[PDB]
RNA sequence: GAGCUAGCCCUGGCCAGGGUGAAGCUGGGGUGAGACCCAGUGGAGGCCCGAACCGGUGGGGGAUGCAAACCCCUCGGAUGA
RNA sequence: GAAUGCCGGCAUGAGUAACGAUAAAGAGGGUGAGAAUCCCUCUCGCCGUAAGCCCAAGGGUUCCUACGCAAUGGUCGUCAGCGUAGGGUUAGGCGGGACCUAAGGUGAAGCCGAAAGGCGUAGCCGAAGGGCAGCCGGUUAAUAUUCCGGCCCUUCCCGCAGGUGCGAUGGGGGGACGCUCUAGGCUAGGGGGACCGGAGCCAUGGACGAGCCCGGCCAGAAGCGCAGGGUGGGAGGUAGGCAAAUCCGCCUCCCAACAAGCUCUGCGUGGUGGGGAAGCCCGGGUGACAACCCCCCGAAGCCAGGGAGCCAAGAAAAGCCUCUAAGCACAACCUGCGGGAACCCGUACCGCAAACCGACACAGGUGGGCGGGUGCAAGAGCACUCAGGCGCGCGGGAGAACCCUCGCCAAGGAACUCUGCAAGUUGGCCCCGUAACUUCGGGAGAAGGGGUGCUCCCUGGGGUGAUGAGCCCCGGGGAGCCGCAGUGAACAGGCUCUGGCGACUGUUUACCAAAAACACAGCUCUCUGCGAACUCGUAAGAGGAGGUAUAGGGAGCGACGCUUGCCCGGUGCCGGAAGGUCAAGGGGAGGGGUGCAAGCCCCGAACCGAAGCCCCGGUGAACGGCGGCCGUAACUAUAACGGUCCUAAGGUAGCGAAAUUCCUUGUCGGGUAAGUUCCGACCUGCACGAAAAGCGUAACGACCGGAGCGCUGUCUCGGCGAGGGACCCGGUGAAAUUGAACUGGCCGUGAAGAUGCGGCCUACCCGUGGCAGGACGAAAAGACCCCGUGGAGCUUUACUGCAGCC
RNA sequence: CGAUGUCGGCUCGUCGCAUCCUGGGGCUGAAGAAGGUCCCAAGGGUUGGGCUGUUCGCCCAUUAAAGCGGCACGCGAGCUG
RNA sequence: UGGGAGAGGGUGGUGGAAUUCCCGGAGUAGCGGUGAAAUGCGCAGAUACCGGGAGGAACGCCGAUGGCGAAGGCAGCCACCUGGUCCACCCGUGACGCUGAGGCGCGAAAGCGUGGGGAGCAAACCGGAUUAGAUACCCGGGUAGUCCACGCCCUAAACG
RNA sequence: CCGAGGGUAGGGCCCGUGACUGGGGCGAAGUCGUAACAAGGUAGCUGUACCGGAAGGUGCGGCUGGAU
């Protein structure tokens, strides 16, 4: 049957994205918490 | 007049359409329209805030000339008479001696190539538009204006008409299509006639899908719910409203009055409606 | 978090084939004029049968499954909300 | 040493289940240490509106070649989507960008909000929509509308020539639009040919044939031909298109009108460039100077912005054309020709799937295009097949029970059972024929029957063409033949009678409920005069609605028919400039503290003082409610009638043992041999009743009752047969569970149901196929029940707040 | 209560005897035939159907008879539901 | 041919009296109603009176024992459209007539459907009286309906 | 071939009968009221509509076969 996961390059990027999450409080927040652990990736890969 | 079916299915038993005889004109200005944006009952937030709104035909926005004492004293031919999606009366195309081409509503009686004109000197003759200190007594007028130069905003629905009833210093005493009696500036304006297309109210939707067509999504009772939803959600099989009936948001919905108490054009209504 | 699901918005797309045969129109009859009657033409419809497509009625299987909802038979809608 | 403890390791179950669609395999020859599993050949089978081909998304090297087999692959492996390495994706024209706008998003102006931020016109962004210039063939191991060959084309820059009032983000025209149906002419595609080309073939009884088999094209600029789309010409006036305007709009006159002219597109032709089979011979070569023609069918595609009808009335913006303003008219633009210039990104491969979403090489899910032929009435249905692609990554045997899927069955025919559940029956088309009732449509495929193949003979009409032959499409009459049987295989209704409920088509608890539930047209009440009511929001702002009482919000009822009674005392809502009550405020009789005092400070009665409530009315399709006892008729029984108590008023019509009736399987009637169900009645209705509508109602229903016919393995009552498993052998090899176990019966005993205690009985040791009585078997710290001064949803005239409104 | 699945049916039995039938008896208000009542006896047997979920019960047609109880109201790691 | 009378019919328009309601003023202790009363209404200012406004229905006097129409029936006034009828002249046609089963059309009131309208009146209904009772007669209210448009119904002591 | 008739299926008319139900006729001395005949104590009758134990009442219109 029709899972969840129907991946979409331009659904992800503009919906967990580095402009998004920088255009709010809440993304920056993010990405700041996400520097903070050092992970290697701010944001999930997406091939444009 | 409305228009019949014969039962070949059992939607078209009842379903009534009009006659549309009234129009010599099929499709629409083309300098005249522009996009009706569809809401879908849904406001600037995306929130619905009308419900049961959605997934009707697409339209066309028709201009609608509901000043007209923009152009006093240049006179105008009848052109057409026309379908419009967008309200229950039909409208009428103007091609002004001026070469400008308008629309205004289509009152009763109206024909193609008749002449209409605007403004204190016109005749009181079906189609003009006067200050409605200048038309007499007693004359039955549509699109009337409720402040001066603030556009017509009264008796646009198909068949209503205000009637002019007295009048009192600077004012006219109109009885709107509600049967509400009320002051309006005299210098407001006010078209002879009455709207026509009086048949739309003998209109016999006849089946679940023409409301569907309409925009008009299916409504759902509140007595059908559960007490999350509504005052008259729940029960245990069917039950009566077991409370004084209620809207969704708890307000009490079988008489109690809700026009705001001190509001200032209190002093302008003289009587309340009627039936 | 609405890439599942619910509703709406914008813009595109899809619905084999067969059946029934509304209004209207033409002619004919009829009448003072009409209604109305007959034949032909016509091709309406949340019309009928049935694939694609959308469903999920009954039964059987499956039940550490092929599958955290599937498989077979049968069954509903299929120009429309 | 225990925490259903935590982390790890290793056991048991066990060589057990399983090894993932029952589309299917067999042999020969290769390779290699090793072969059911890799490569090649022959044979068999499976898909063929796909299980073939082409796009899109998503995936991201998986593509090609060499070398490999530890692990991955449910077995094997020499193979592979695996390991190593090298190679591979080529564009002005295809897709996207350097173009346009849609929802939406963003947002100079502006508005709002403690902060963060929320809005917002223009403008900007935003595509699978608009717009825009490339077709055919060849080539590589791997890319091709990209490279190459042939023939075409677009834009930018510069120059030459001719022409013209040139000039825009401004004005205008255009772009520009629905649904159903559909004309003409074509094209795609297909069938046939006694005509054209071809390596061959003659079999096993016949055939050297008007024989078999194979093929008979594709692209193409200008012209030209056919078919279509689009489009009036001129003049005079002019105040409208937010400047101007010769343009557009409006008015008048003249001429043209289903035409024509001009323009645009499709198809055909067209210089030229290509392709070219079976077969045979090692992807190649030959065939081959291959031939490339005739007839028929024919789109849903094309001409297209075509036509008609209908109501629910069907994007925007740019390109483009025209008009002018500043300007500039040494310019500028237009047309033709010439040279030059023409960037960035994608392009491999999978793509109904082993490469995408499902943890898996997972019977599931995934949008668009092409999708051949024959027969069956048609068709994308069904059977078989082409091209193409597969046999589903464990096999070999055996021929038990039992299970699954399937075939048949004497006699009976629902006796099965909660129920004909299931499975039979019926089944397409043509013809004859078809009931109550009905809203006149229907009910209807009602029911029920007859026909159906093949051969010969005679013949009617239609298309193409030519009016004819040929081909092709609908028919009609007669005479015959064979079989158990002619929709001979596959696909393809069982029917009727009578209740309940819901009018109907629709909708729903994704994953235990599809219904009588929700919705629904329709009916009624009520709010709302527009800066509407109402809804979201602190607000600004939005929705309502660019609507205006024939409109919009809320509520209940639910097509239609005939109807919807009585109660306003209580609650609600509506009306009520009185009266009562009433807060802050006003007022200040009169007290109090302090100071020598002027003064400072404090308390404070009458009186005035809103909404709300009190009070007076109205109001039921507002919340709701609609009696009790006793007596009475010339047989009896029963009471039309009366008495009295109570109420705000005592249930009307219609209906009733009901989706409601307790007693109850009430009683009577029908149906049956027999009927707790069913249907029809009766009425002492425990406990119907009129918009939480009452009573009906044609049609409809995968709804729930009852009956009958048909026919059956449902059953009496079972038998046999098929395949996939179970079983055996080779390969790979789980699981929950598990205190340890050397784990029998009876009768007792025991915390009250003992393999484990007592007494007695029985019993050599260990397995394999089977069955499920026990191990209070497994699973899940009972979801029932209670308990906890545990929790959460929901309600209200519980308490107390708050939003909102007054 | 860190679960001892609960009505009815079906299938499959096995046991008790306070015996429904068949076998053996005494008493009788036992003439015969047919019964009544009690005693012994558990070897075997103890039908098909309509109604209802039913167990039970009522009914139809038969029968030698149409027994009554236990086995976790026997039996859901056997099925139904 | 020329004339006449008439509430004959259909459409649109329009005039005054009256009732009810609403607004203003003036004013006060009752009004109303009946056989007598009560319900009802009124100091929250009724009734009676004056000015203003809205709306509906019906047309006083003329009016008659009258007129018209086939019947049902038709009554303010105005205009338009239309029927029947009588008389004079003795001009035209030349028996072209009478009746009329079926058919068709008209058809008071009440009633029905869909819209609208709603002053007064008023089935049902509620209340007050009366009465043994009073589902009546009398009184205070009061919904259909009475009115308009379109479409049905087709009845009558449709009678002379 | 036709064919008595037999069979399957479906309709039409008529007769008899049916729980129960509807009114009707008749029947020496039942119960309730008093509608009509006199102005019958509300003049009556009437088509229709609504209501009520019953006769009846009432509304709208009509008739005199109404009295003074
Ligand atoms: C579905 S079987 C599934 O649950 C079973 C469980 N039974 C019980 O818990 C029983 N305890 C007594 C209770 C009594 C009542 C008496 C009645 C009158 C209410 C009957 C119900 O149960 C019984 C569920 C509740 Cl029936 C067993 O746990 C079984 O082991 C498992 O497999
Ligand atoms: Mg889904
Ligand atoms: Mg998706
Ligand atoms: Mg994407
Ligand atoms: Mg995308
Ligand atoms: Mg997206
Ligand atoms: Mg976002
Ligand atoms: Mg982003
Ligand atoms: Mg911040
Ligand atoms: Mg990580
Ligand atoms: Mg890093
Ligand atoms: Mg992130
Ligand atoms: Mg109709
Ligand atoms: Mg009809
Ligand atoms: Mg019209
Ligand atoms: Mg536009
Ligand atoms: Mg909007
Ligand atoms: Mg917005
Ligand atoms: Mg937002
Ligand atoms: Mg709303
Ligand atoms: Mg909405
Ligand atoms: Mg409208
Ligand atoms: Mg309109
Ligand atoms: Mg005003
Ligand atoms: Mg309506
Ligand atoms: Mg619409
Ligand atoms: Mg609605
Ligand atoms: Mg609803
Ligand atoms: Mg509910
Ligand atoms: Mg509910
Ligand atoms: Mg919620
Ligand atoms: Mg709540
Ligand atoms: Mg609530
Ligand atoms: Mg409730
Ligand atoms: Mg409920
Ligand atoms: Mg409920
Ligand atoms: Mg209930
Ligand atoms: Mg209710
Ligand atoms: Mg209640
Ligand atoms: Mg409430
Ligand atoms: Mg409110
Ligand atoms: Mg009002
Ligand atoms: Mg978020
Ligand atoms: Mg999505
Ligand atoms: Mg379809
Ligand atoms: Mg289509
Ligand atoms: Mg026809
Ligand atoms: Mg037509
Ligand atoms: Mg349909
Ligand atoms: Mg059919
Ligand atoms: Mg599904
Ligand atoms: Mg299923
Ligand atoms: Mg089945
Ligand atoms: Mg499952
Ligand atoms: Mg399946
Ligand atoms: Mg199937
Ligand atoms: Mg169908
Ligand atoms: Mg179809
Ligand atoms: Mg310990
Ligand atoms: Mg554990
Ligand atoms: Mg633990
Ligand atoms: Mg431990
Ligand atoms: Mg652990
Ligand atoms: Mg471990
Ligand atoms: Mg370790
Ligand atoms: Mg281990
Ligand atoms: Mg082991
Ligand atoms: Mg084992
Ligand atoms: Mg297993
Ligand atoms: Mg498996
Ligand atoms: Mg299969
Ligand atoms: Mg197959
Ligand atoms: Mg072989
Ligand atoms: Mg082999
Ligand atoms: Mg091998
Ligand atoms: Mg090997
Ligand atoms: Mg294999
Ligand atoms: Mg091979
Ligand atoms: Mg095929
Ligand atoms: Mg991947
Ligand atoms: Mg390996
Ligand atoms: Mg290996
Ligand atoms: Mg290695
Ligand atoms: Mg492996
Ligand atoms: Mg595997
Ligand atoms: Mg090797
Ligand atoms: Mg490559
Ligand atoms: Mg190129
Ligand atoms: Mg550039
Ligand atoms: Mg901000
Ligand atoms: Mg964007
Ligand atoms: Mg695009
Ligand atoms: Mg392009
Ligand atoms: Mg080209
Ligand atoms: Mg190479
Ligand atoms: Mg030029
Ligand atoms: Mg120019
Ligand atoms: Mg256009
Ligand atoms: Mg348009
Ligand atoms: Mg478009
Ligand atoms: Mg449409
Ligand atoms: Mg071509
Ligand atoms: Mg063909
Ligand atoms: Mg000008
Ligand atoms: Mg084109
Ligand atoms: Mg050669
Ligand atoms: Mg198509
Ligand atoms: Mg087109
Ligand atoms: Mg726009
Ligand atoms: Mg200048
Ligand atoms: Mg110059
Ligand atoms: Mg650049
Ligand atoms: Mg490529
Ligand atoms: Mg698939
Ligand atoms: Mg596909
Ligand atoms: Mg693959
Ligand atoms: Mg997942
Ligand atoms: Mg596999
Ligand atoms: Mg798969
Ligand atoms: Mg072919
Ligand atoms: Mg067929
Ligand atoms: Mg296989
Ligand atoms: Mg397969
Ligand atoms: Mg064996
Ligand atoms: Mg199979
Ligand atoms: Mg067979
Ligand atoms: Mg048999
Ligand atoms: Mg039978
Ligand atoms: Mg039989
Ligand atoms: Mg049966
Ligand atoms: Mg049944
Ligand atoms: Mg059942
Ligand atoms: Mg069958
Ligand atoms: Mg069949
Ligand atoms: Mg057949
Ligand atoms: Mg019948
Ligand atoms: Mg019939
Ligand atoms: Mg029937
Ligand atoms: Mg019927
Ligand atoms: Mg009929
Ligand atoms: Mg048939
Ligand atoms: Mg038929
Ligand atoms: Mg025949
Ligand atoms: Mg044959
Ligand atoms: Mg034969
Ligand atoms: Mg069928
Ligand atoms: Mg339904
Ligand atoms: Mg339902
Ligand atoms: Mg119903
Ligand atoms: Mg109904
Ligand atoms: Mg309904
Ligand atoms: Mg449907
Ligand atoms: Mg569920
Ligand atoms: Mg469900
Ligand atoms: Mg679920
Ligand atoms: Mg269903
Ligand atoms: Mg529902
Ligand atoms: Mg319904
Ligand atoms: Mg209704
Ligand atoms: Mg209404
Ligand atoms: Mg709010
Ligand atoms: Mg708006
Ligand atoms: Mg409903
Ligand atoms: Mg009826
Ligand atoms: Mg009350
Ligand atoms: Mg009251
Ligand atoms: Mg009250
Ligand atoms: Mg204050
Ligand atoms: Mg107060
Ligand atoms: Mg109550
Ligand atoms: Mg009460
Ligand atoms: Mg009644
Ligand atoms: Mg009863
Ligand atoms: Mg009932
Ligand atoms: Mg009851
Ligand atoms: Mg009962
Ligand atoms: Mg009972
Ligand atoms: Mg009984
Ligand atoms: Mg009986
Ligand atoms: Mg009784
Ligand atoms: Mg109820
Ligand atoms: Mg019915
Ligand atoms: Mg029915
Ligand atoms: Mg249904
Ligand atoms: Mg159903
Ligand atoms: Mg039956
Ligand atoms: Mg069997
Ligand atoms: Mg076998
Ligand atoms: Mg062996
Ligand atoms: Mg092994
Ligand atoms: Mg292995
Ligand atoms: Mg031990
Ligand atoms: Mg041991
Ligand atoms: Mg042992
Ligand atoms: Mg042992
Ligand atoms: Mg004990
Ligand atoms: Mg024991
Ligand atoms: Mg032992
Ligand atoms: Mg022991
Ligand atoms: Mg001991
Ligand atoms: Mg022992
Ligand atoms: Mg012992
Ligand atoms: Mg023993
Ligand atoms: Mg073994
Ligand atoms: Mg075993
Ligand atoms: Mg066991
Ligand atoms: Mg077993
Ligand atoms: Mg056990
Ligand atoms: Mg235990
Ligand atoms: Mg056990
Ligand atoms: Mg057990
Ligand atoms: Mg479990
Ligand atoms: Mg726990
Ligand atoms: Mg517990
Ligand atoms: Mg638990
Ligand atoms: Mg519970
Ligand atoms: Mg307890
Ligand atoms: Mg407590
Ligand atoms: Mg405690
Ligand atoms: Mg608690
Ligand atoms: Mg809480
Ligand atoms: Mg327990
Ligand atoms: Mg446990
Ligand atoms: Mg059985
Ligand atoms: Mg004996
Ligand atoms: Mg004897
Ligand atoms: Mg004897
Ligand atoms: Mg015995
Ligand atoms: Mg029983
Ligand atoms: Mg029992
Ligand atoms: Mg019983
Ligand atoms: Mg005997
Ligand atoms: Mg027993
Ligand atoms: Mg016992
Ligand atoms: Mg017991
Ligand atoms: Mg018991
Ligand atoms: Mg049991
Ligand atoms: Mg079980
Ligand atoms: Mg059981
Ligand atoms: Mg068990
Ligand atoms: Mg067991
Ligand atoms: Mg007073
Ligand atoms: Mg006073
Ligand atoms: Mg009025
Ligand atoms: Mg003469
Ligand atoms: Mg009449
Ligand atoms: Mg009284
Ligand atoms: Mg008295
Ligand atoms: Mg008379
Ligand atoms: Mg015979
Ligand atoms: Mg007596
Ligand atoms: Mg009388
Ligand atoms: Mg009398
Ligand atoms: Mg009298
Ligand atoms: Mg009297
Ligand atoms: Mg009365």
């Known amino acids: ?48 | 007049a409305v228009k019949k079916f014969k039962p070949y299915t059992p939607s078209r038993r009842f379903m009534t359409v009009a006659d549309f005889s009234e129009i010599t004109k099929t499709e629409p200005e083309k300098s005249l329209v522009k996009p009706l944006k569809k809401t879908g009952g849904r406001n600037n937030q995306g929130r619905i805030t009308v419900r049961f709104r959605g997934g009707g035909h697409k339209r066309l926005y028709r201009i609608i000339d509901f000043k007209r004492w923009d152009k006093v004293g240049i006179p105008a031919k009848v052109a057409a008479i026309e379908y419009d999606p967008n309200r229950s009366a039909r409208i009428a195309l103007l091609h002004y001696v001026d070469g400008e081409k308008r629309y205004i509503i289509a009152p009763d009686g109206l024909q193609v190539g008749q002449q209409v004109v605007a403004g204190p000197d016109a005749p009181i003759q079906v189609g003009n538009a006067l200050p409605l200190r200048f038309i007499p007594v007693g004359t039955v007028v549509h699109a009337v204006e409720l402040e001066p130069k603030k556009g017509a905003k009264l008796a646009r629905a198909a068949g209503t008409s205000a009637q002019i009833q007295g009048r009192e210093g600077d004012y006219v005493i109109l009885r709107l299509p509600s049967g509400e009696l009320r002051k309006v500036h005299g210098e407001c304006y006010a078209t002879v006639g009455a709207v026509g297309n009086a048949d739309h109210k003998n209109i016999v939707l006849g089946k679940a899908g023409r409301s569907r067509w309409l925009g008009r999504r299916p409504h759902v009772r509140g007595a059908a719910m559960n007490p999350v939803d509504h005052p008259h959600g729940g029960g245990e099989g069917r039950a009566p409203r077991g409370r004084p009936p209620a809207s969704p948001w708890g307000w009490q919905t079988k008489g109690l009055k809700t026009r705001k108490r001190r509001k200032p054009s209190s002093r302008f209504i003289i009587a309340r409606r009627k039936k």
């Open chain 1, 1 to 48: 049957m029709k899972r969840t996961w129907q991946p979409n390059r331009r659904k992800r990027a503009k919906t967990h994205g580095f402009r998004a999450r920088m255009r709010t409080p809440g993304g920056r927040k993010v990405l700041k918490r996400r520097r903070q652990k050092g992970r290697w990736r701010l944001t999930p890969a997406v091939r444009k």
